[PDB]
């Protein structure tokens, strides 16, 4: 396998399905990345993450640099070895957790800058490295959005140069740039233009899911995604709810990460094709059905709603484990249905059918 | 398989190795039972419990009756179905958690008595049912020890009769009686005599590990175990540390349960053949070795001390999972080495070698 190759196998409107080939494996797009905060997808062994269908997971640069430490992980062999996940890993850059000077930022639990962020991602042994950016809070005035976007584009060039100057990283990993500009079309365009002039392996749409709500997010995606190079992956960071994913794919997004399936699983929320359920609710106390009637996951093959209800109410670790496994499996099944429907030219109908039942 | 059959395959001194055949499976003795408090061996799926070598697990009557409820579990199909463990389950009776009238006891989180305890164990679908007893606090005066023992023997007969009057339970489960009498040889003998006159499928030594310490516990086992019927299993409830298990087997015990491997795993203590380690200690922060150098468990095949150190310090659920799996696997490997050494007539040497290295 090459360092990086993205191929589109089929299209429907703005939606695409295809593959990213990297040295540690192939990633089927559109892809959902389970989030490994501190070198673990919470409550799951890596084999279990893989069994659900995940091709790639996300690691958080900010958190890993605080504990256990980036240099410590490198000394121990890198993140893949440390946590026992041998497939691709994408690492975010830290600009979200940060949300200061033109050089970068210092904070108390440390320093982050374009150079230091790329270096930490190198120390971890990341396959997909994200450029270090400045993330504008929503809402943002035009002036502030422009200033943060301009800074982010200067930092994208510094990110690019830091990555390239590290031969081992440049030869074996990929680097993605991050579009900014808040909700403003002209800034989004300036940003896209700047990123494409520098050139990246992939392009994230940054700055959304920051409080603007789905309508506004979709409106911004409507004009922002066509500004990115068509022949590279489009990554929407920190999204999201199933309906957010479907609608973002309808608008050209190829990759996703979110803590929702994991976090909400631990809290008692299970995803189903008829919408999420609150497993702690009394209505589930003697319900022998699985979490979801169609789900192929091991949890739904083996345990009832009633049992998982008990586990979560009791604070048992196995409750977290089962909820999380199901939720991640559900998310992967969603992505698989999206991939198959696009390849078969029936994604429009899938989205319609999905929504009518999920929000019945 | 029969309802119940215990066969001794080999002996060395007072130590025995053999099998208990029951309808849901065979139990290799000497046996360690992982404890499932509230319908879960904490942090482990039942398949993982089985993969470690466990033949049987313990369920806590007291806790299950409080949450989720005994009648609720019966309505849902019984404990095996509820939690997804299809092999034998032993349930304790509640007399430990209780530690009042001659009829039984009422308390606030409910009622327990010989009849109600046997009924709850029936509702759960237990394979090995324990008689309901009264457990004397240590230390106990001779007079108090005698009174509690006498009461326990009256309650053993009531337990026996309740079990027998329930045809389904009598035909498919086994009933074990519990010897009491504190540290007093004459009371222990009276108790053994009373239990054997009633007749049970197995005999537990109750009332120990209550603060008397290992020396005293071993002294009491020295005279108490020979009082029990030789041809039935001998169960030491709530024991224990590896060296406690070895010494109890040297004195004729065939079965064990304890929360130590699970509880102490979650807290950061890993068992090793050179003794327990505190994985949170700084000395493990960059240690690439497995938890134990010889352990065959999946955790030690795959992850380092350093990683598990990180997980436990971070409060991650996977830390609990890995620690627990290892500790239960260690305990099963201990039991396997005990079984093999007795069968091969080299258990004396094993015990000696085990102790010299574990306490080096
Ligand atoms: N949801 C927006 C977002 C999530 N994670 C992010 N990480 C970075 N560097 N930048 C961003 O804009 C975002
Ligand atoms: N360690 C003593 C002990 C543990 N669990 C027990 N359960 C019962 N019924 N009786 C007992 O004496 C004990
Ligand atoms: Zn499922
Ligand atoms: Zn191990």
């Amino acid at each position: 396998r090459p360092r990086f190759s993205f191929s589109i196998a089929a299209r429907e409107g703005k939606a695409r399905t295809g593959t990213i080939e990297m040295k540690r494996g192939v990633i089927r797009t559109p892809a959902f990345m389970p989030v490994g905060t501190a070198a673990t997808v919470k409550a799951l062994k890596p084999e279990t993450v893989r069994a659900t269908g995940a091709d790639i997971i996300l690691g958080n640069t900010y958190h890993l640099m605080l504990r256990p430490g980036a240099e410590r992980i490198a000394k121990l062999g890198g993140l893949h070895s440390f946590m026992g996940w041998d497939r691709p890993i994408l690492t975010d850059s830290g600009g979200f957790q940060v949300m200061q000077s033109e050089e970068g930022v210092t904070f108390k639990s440390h320093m982050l800058s374009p150079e230091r962020s790329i270096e930490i991602q190198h120390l971890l042994g990341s396959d997909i490295v994200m450029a270090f950016d400045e993330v504008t809070p929503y809402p943002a005035t035009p002036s502030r959005a422009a200033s943060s976007m301009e800074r982010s584009m200067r930092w994208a060039k510094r990110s690019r140069d830091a990555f390239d100057s590290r031969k081992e990283q440049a030869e074996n990993a990929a680097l993605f740039g991050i579009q900014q500009g808040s909700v403003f079309e002209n800034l989004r365009q300036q940003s896209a233009d700047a990123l494409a002039e520098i050139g990246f392996d992939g392009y994230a749409v940054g700055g959304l899911s920051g409080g603007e709500g789905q309508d506004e997010m979709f409106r911004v995606l409507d004009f922002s995604v066509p500004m990115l190079p068509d022949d590279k992956p489009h990554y929407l960071m920190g999204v999201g709810k199933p309906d957010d994913i479907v609608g973002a794919v309808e608008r050209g997004i190829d990759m996703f990460d979110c803590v929702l399936p994991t976090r909400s699983g631990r809290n008692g929320q299970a995803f189903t094709w008829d919408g999420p359920i609150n497993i702690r609710n009394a209505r589930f106390s003697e319900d022998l059905k699985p979490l979801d009637s169609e789900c192929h996951c091991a949890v739904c093959q083996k345990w009832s709603r009633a049992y998982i209800h008990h586990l979560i109410r009791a604070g048992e670790i196995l409750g977290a484990m089962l909820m999380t496994e199901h939720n991640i499996a559900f998310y992967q099944q969603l992505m698989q249905k999206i991939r198959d429907s696009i390849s078969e030219g029936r994604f429009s109908q899938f989205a319609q059918d999905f929504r009518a039942r999920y929000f019945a």
Side-chain angles (χ1 to χ4, degrees), chain A residues 1-74 76-98 101-107 109-135 137-143 145-166 169-196 198-240 242-262 264-266 268-277 279-295 297-300 303-347 349-351 353-360:
Chain A
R1 282 186 296 273
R3 178 189 70 84
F4 190 85
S5 67
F6 176 54
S7 192
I8 298 159
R11 296 175 162 93
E12 185 178 329
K14 295 180 168 178
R16 310 103 66 79
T17 183
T19 54
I20 301 165
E21 291 185 16
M22 304 195 67
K23 290 170 191 264
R24 282 186 177 271
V26 181
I27 303 150
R28 298 170 288 175
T29 65
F32 182 80
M33 299 177 280
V35 174
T37 298
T40 165
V41 177
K42 288 187 183 35
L44 300 179
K45 288 178 178 174
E47 54 200 81
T48 304
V49 180
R50 175 56 185 173
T52 65
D55 295 326
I56 169 164
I57 65 175
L58 180 149
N60 291 137
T61 293
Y62 166 85
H63 293 291
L64 294 169
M65 65 183 295
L66 300 174
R67 177 170 68 187
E71 281 71 9
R72 172 162 289 170
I73 283 168
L76 297 174
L79 180 56
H80 295 79
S81 181
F82 183 63
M83 72 181 292
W85 175 268
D86 68 10
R87 275 175 187 274
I89 297 176
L90 180 147
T91 44
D92 61 1
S93 58
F96 189 71
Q97 294 80 10
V98 158
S101 54
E102 185 59 30
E103 294 308 323
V105 61
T106 57
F107 58 99
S109 166
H110 285 76
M111 187 273 193
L112 239 20
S113 67
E115 297 74 22
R116 181 52 183 159
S117 183
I118 297 314
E119 181 186 39
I120 288 161
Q121 295 180 74
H122 171 64
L123 290 165
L124 298 175
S126 171
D127 304 282
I128 303 176
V129 177
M130 303 299 301
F132 187 70
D133 60 343
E134 183 174 84
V135 194
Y138 181 85
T141 58
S143 168
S147 295
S148 281
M149 181 273 297
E150 288 159 6
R151 168 168 283 168
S152 292
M153 305 298 94
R154 288 184 298 267
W155 286 7
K157 174 56 171 163
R158 279 168 63 187
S159 292
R160 177 80 265 177
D161 290 348
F163 180 97
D164 289 339
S165 75
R166 204 176 271 104
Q169 191 177 37
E171 288 172 20
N172 293 286
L175 183 65
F176 283 21
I178 309 174
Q179 186 201 46
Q180 297 293 352
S182 189
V183 301
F184 303 112
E185 186 173 14
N186 64 329
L187 301 180
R188 284 277 171 187
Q189 181 69 70
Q190 292 171 29
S191 184
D193 289 342
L195 291 177
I198 295 158
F200 292 93
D201 296 310
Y203 298 84
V205 173
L208 301 180
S209 72
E212 72 279 0
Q214 188 189 84
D215 282 3
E216 187 71 339
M217 184 177 76
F218 284 177
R219 169 177 88 78
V220 175
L221 292 176
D222 284 338
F223 55 69
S224 295
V225 190
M227 305 166 174
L228 311 173
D230 184 75
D231 68 342
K232 304 287 206 234
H234 309 332
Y235 171 24
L236 184 57
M237 298 177 289
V239 174
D243 187 47
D244 288 340
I245 290 172
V246 171
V249 171
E250 290 181 280
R251 290 171 179 75
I253 298 299
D254 309 303
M255 300 169 58
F256 303 90
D257 75 273
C258 185
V259 302
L260 189 44
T262 43
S264 74
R266 294 189 312 273
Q269 166 170 87
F271 290 99
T272 77
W273 295 110
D274 308 288
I277 59 175
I279 203 58
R280 296 177 71 117
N281 189 283
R283 73 179 60 99
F284 299 117
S285 64
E286 299 187 350
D287 189 344
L288 287 174
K289 297 186 301 292
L291 290 171
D292 179 271
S293 69
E294 292 171 18
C295 181
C297 93
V299 179
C300 294
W303 294 281
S304 63
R305 280 164 178 200
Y307 182 58
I308 302 170
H309 169 93
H310 161 67
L311 293 174
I312 293 284
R313 287 169 76 105
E316 284 283 355
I317 284 165
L318 186 62
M321 294 165 55
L322 296 183
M323 289 288 296
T324 300
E325 175 176 356
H326 166 80
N327 281 351
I328 293 286
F330 178 91
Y331 266 58
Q332 294 301 329
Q333 286 165 92
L334 170 67
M335 305 317 295
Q336 186 61 54
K337 290 171 186 300
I338 294 173
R339 289 194 298 265
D340 280 321
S341 66
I342 300 163
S343 186
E344 295 180 7
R346 56 182 182 76
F347 178 49
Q349 186 71 50
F350 169 76
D353 297 338
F354 159 81
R355 289 194 195 100
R357 181 183 169 189
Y358 192 83
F359 301 105

